[PDB]
Design a protein around this ligand. Structure first.
Ligand SMILES: Nc1ncnc2c1ncn2[C@@H]1O[C@H](COP(=O)(O)CP(=O)(O)OP(=O)(O)O)[C@@H](O)[C@H]1O
Ligand SMILES: Nc1ncnc2c1ncn2[C@@H]1O[C@H](COP(=O)(O)CP(=O)(O)OP(=O)(O)O)[C@@H](O)[C@H]1O
Ligand SMILES: Nc1ncnc2c1ncn2[C@@H]1O[C@H](COP(=O)(O)CP(=O)(O)OP(=O)(O)O)[C@@H](O)[C@H]1O
Ligand SMILES: [Ca+2]
Ligand SMILES: [Ca+2]
Ligand SMILES: [Ca+2]
Ligand SMILES: [Cl-]
Ligand SMILES: [Cl-]
Ligand SMILES: [Cl-]
Lengths: 461, 461, 461
């Protein structure tokens, strides 16, 4: 008989699986909402700098109305290489935060010390890519190890996951401390790490530490040491499938599973995956209204406490967003609180600025009175941001990039406890100035020019 | 010099060839209509059960308006494996009858006895796939060997082929006798088969027999025995091309040939093949009106007798269908008669129920008075049926699946000599009840609930 | 660690690079317009005959409205084989002139003699393809070696390149002399070629010569001799990439470069490359209005003289074309002059014939008064011509084919110094006959039936 070659079949379930991590794909858990699960592991948070400035530049006339297609191409080219090195070293890319991403190495408690050596060596090879030579892009890496807690929340047709814990805080703080082209270990990490191998220098006014270089023992063989660590890695491609990047590529049609997975991904993306829409139309530089919500609590690391609150918060957010036409792009822990990245005009309608401000007030009013929510903080920005699918062929997500996305993210941090909006949203909308308040100009990190920032006061006095 | 790798070129003629068997692709014959050709061979009729119930289930709310895409995926996943095993064992998939399919091993008279061993071993490996574990699907296989007669009919822009003979009757009867997960040999088969190898048990009130297992001679080598049989197989991939499933994959641009082949395939499919339409839009769960015609004769096996009649019948069918907006999905011998599967709203228009009943009457009136047509039987059903491309990448066809397709197929059998319509067609249309007659409720095989079935009586009394 | 296979990534810059030669892709030069660059090399001009007759045939009823898709398929099938043999022998396909194409082997002065042996052996293998057996197609090859001069001209959003020199004239004249299935060397070639190897017969009333066959020295090894010549070839795939046809396939995202390259390609093609348009819709048999401009000079080979003139000519052409809706398909040296192939209704509008004639007059009036332009000659033809992407997957261009394209090309040659239009353009438009003049019927090469040809006289007397 003939033994014909079996072509890699590109099933919808395999296409959908590219938008999610192995954490979710092979994570079988109760459909009850919320849901929590606890485990240990190492977290890597890679952040690329200079792309929002590049995104701003690509809207200019010189790219001849191909700025969105020029941006995805160069953006994905560099991120694909990063994603490969994460996947090849046994990592799981959890989430794509615009030009930044969050990776995870999930392991049992005792095997952290060994994994951090793998994650550190991985992070150095990632940094090694962009020391060579896409002329002004830098990269920041923060590493943290310890207890992590997944939270899965949502309704019957949608689902959203996010990670919680001291490690999730540590990794972000570590990355904020990071200078241009540096690797920062949290205080719990480095303590967990094998201290004989890793050389470091102390950060000023900080208990975290910077990695200079690995100084491995004499007869050390990283190829052998890696193979030991792969024993504890669950879904690392092996045997016949060792040539693959992800085990998710080998998935087979399973209606039950696909129904579960499709809830996490947007309808626009599913239409494209189902071949009922062209691939290029999701990549675009369009005028949107960013609405960056941020919910803070008394104890941010307590999964059983904040889990129910975020579920209650989501159910209201998604409902009021649906009335005005908004959509939740991403949900993730952003500096001591869960943050919903909402977008209007993704759903293009006039009076979008008038809707966005009213919904921010609507969300603020409900979220303030939900139990255990200590502080609600919302930021609103409007302008030309990039929208599109960012990542590798086997691991990518739909995300938004731009200076207005940065702006809205800072506004909720720098102006907490209140709803805030930029100059474009203020003037574009036309409620009287009694509806707003002019705020003092604060100098903000990671943003060029705020202009006059305002606080949406409300309809009544 | 450099010797670069030659990428498999996906020409339109190769794409079109996937919708047809090798019987038609490499069958060069006169363009006169009708056309008959006579030969010997073994027929396998594989039928999957439980998918119309699954199709009904996939229209529910839990699949979140991705039931059509969920269905094709799981359906094709299982059928692809079946198609592979047919193609790898040297078979030719003639036709896809919804979730069922018809295969053919064409050989000279004396080599039947050897081929049936190959077809039986093939059928056992096909049954072997679904004994393991898509939780409630069963499969039925019927096998028949003997004289077969092809009939090619149609007009100048369209063509339709179908097989005729005692073997074509035997194989269907064999499959109807088959219990869940069984292999049934016709009485002519088993007599043709090597009786020393095959063990069987007798079917009650039947001259056909069930296959239990192969009991091959002591020093038998199926790999060697297969290679002998491949000598008599014309188009079995070999040499440089042995890695391919079909020889049709190696086809090269030939306007003459492509003009001949494109007539067999629908315009909707050609538009998709020509890349003037997205792939996903043909896969859909849509409300249609099935019109299942069935023409019976005095001698069903006589190709020279019924061939001209079916040609005359087609020419009227296609003309009156074009007036109302119908389309012939499939034509094939279904239990002692040639049966046209027609579909309305494939061509979406209001008053589609009013058109379907009038055309059934129109077809009935003409077909009754065409010479040699003993009995005309038409069944009409309306509801949500699945439409889409079913099969393997190299061998697939556009077909329809659903409980309403089953219903219309039974109605013409159980209520012969008259036009019949279901409750949905009766009430949806609004001719007075004088135009219809209420029929007695018969218990029908392969259908859940008929409801009140009616007979379309006519305009006049 | 795992070392996964790296799938050929199909970046937009790689897709765009297929529409251009290595001359342009790896040619880094000043953005000033015009730009000239001088070098030596061998030119091959392959021309296929009988396809415009085939194109005319494919518009008939027998192809069932798939003539455009049938034509591209068979056309590209034969041209792909030609393109491969050019690329494999180290050539660079400069331009696709409908069913004809222009190749280039760029080398230093002293290595011509060796390259011509490679080009001749290449041309014989190209001719060898179509001596076997797409029933009435012939091929003509002309070869010329010597000094070549590139000219790059255009505006800020578009660019156009073309080659100038005695070699560029020689190669066209050589091809015009060529009988059906012949290889013609120019007088400078053959003198450059190794005369011991190549056997020839003299052409009547001509200093050019026909190639009969190569008669290589005793212990000659073409595989070894080729490898010597590849030392002087810049971009010939080698090492890890020797399995590729073009080095351009290995291109990596470079915004600067991609901005430069995208100007050469049409917006319609970029939309398709960006996946915002289906591939099939550019392939079509549509009614157009061809406007074939031809600018002649005192010294056609002088790059510094005619370069500025063509730049000045282009800037007016593109502007007046944009008013009426025209588009420049191709620009190239056609028999002693630079020729712009313009097309209307590519931009479908009524009164397209009324626009085309006025623009021809507009272009004629300006171009006549531009310095150094000795003779302006314009031809206008209207009818069903083929439009689509012609070539290989790695090297293809958007071009137009048809008898009306031939007609407009002859009209400007046979009726120089004036604007001319065919019978279809005359009668379809409705300016009074005072606006036109009836011309005498000249017998023209490469066209079937002119009908009454007219001269667009003008609005005033
Ligand atoms: N798509 C997205 N997902 C998550 N966070 C985002 C985001 N877009 C912007 N932000 C937020 O905006 C803030 C900006 O971070 P910074 O590090 O100061 C900018 P950068 O990374 O140095 O260069 P960039 O502006 O090119 O991104 C971060 O706190 C980040 O969380
Ligand atoms: N697309 C199609 N092509 C040909 N015949 C069809 C068809 N859809 C339904 N039928 C007819 O409907 C009848 C139903 O056959 P059965 O075997 O009783 C149903 P089954 O195969 O057991 O499970 P199913 O209902 O999931 O198909 C058959 O006689 C068949 O010919
Ligand atoms: N797309 C295109 N690009 C460049 N020139 C074209 C063209 N279409 C037609 N022509 C011109 O039309 C003329 C016709 O050339 P001929 O050689 O006489 C026709 P042929 O090649 O023998 O068969 P054909 O008519 O199938 O092409 C040439 O001078 C050519 O330059
Ligand atoms: Ca960032
Ligand atoms: Ca069935
Ligand atoms: Ca030609
Ligand atoms: Cl998260
Ligand atoms: Cl049939
Ligand atoms: Cl040119």
């Amino acid at each position: 008989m003939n033994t014909p070659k079996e072509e890699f079949q590109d099933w919808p379930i395999v296409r959908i699986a590219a938008h999610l991590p192995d954490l979710i794909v092979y994570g079988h858990f109760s459909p009850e909402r919320p849901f929590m699960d606890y485990f240990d592991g190492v977290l890597m948070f890679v952040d690329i700098s200079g792309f929002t400035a590049m995104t701003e530049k690509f809207s200019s006339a010189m790219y001849m109305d191909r700025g969105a297609e020029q941006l995805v191409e160069i953006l994905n080219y560099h991120i694909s290489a990063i994603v490969e090195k994460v996947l090849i070293f046994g990592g799981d890319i959890l989430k794509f935060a615009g030009d930044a991403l969050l990776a995870l190495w999930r392991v049992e408690r005792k095997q952290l010390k060994n994994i951090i050596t793998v994650v550190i060596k991985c992070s150095l090879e990632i940094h090694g890519l962009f020391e060579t030579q896409g002329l002004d892009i830098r990269v920041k890496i923060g590493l943290a190890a310890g207890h992590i807690s997944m939270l899965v929340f949502g309704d019957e047709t949608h689902s959203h996951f996010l990670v919680i814990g001291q490690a999730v805080d540590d990794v972000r703080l570590a990355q904020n401390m990071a200078q241009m082209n540096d690797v920062i270990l949290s205080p719990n990490c480095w303590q967990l790490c094998d201290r004989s191998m890793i050389e470091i220098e102390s950060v000023p006014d900080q208990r975290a530490v910077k990695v200079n270089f690995l100084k491995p023992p004499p007869n050390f063989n990283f190829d052998e040491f890696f193979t030991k660590c792969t024993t504890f890695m669950h879904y690392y491609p092996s045997g016949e499938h060792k040539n693959l990047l992800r085990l998710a590529c080998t998935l087979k049609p399973d209606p039950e599973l696909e129904m579960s997975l499709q809830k996490y991904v947007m309808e626009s993306i599913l239409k494209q995956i189902d071949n009922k829409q062209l691939q290029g139309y999701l990549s675009e530089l369009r005028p949107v209204t960013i609405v960056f919500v941020n919910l803070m609590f008394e104890d941010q690391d307590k999964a059983e406490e904040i889990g129910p609150a975020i579920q209650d918060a989501y159910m209201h957010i998604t409902s009021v967003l649906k009335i005005f036409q908004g959509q939740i792009n991403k949900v993730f822990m952003f500096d001591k609180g869960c943050s919903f990245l909402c977008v209007f005009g993704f759903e293009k309608v006039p009076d979008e600025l008038t809707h966005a401000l009213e919904c921010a007030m609507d969300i603020f009013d409900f979220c303030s009175q939900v139990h255990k929510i200590q502080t609600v903080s919302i930021g609103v920005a409007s302008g030309i941001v990039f929208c599109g699918i960012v990542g590798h062929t086997v691991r990518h997500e739909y995300t938004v990039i731009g200076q207005k996305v940065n702006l809205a993210a800072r506004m909720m941090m720098y102006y907490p406890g209140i709803v805030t909006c930029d100059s474009v949203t203020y003037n574009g909308s036309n409620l009287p100035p009694y509806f707003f308040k002019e705020l003092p100009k604060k100098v903000m990190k990671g943003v060029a020019d705020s202009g006059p920032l305002y606080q949406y006061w409300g309809r009544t006095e």
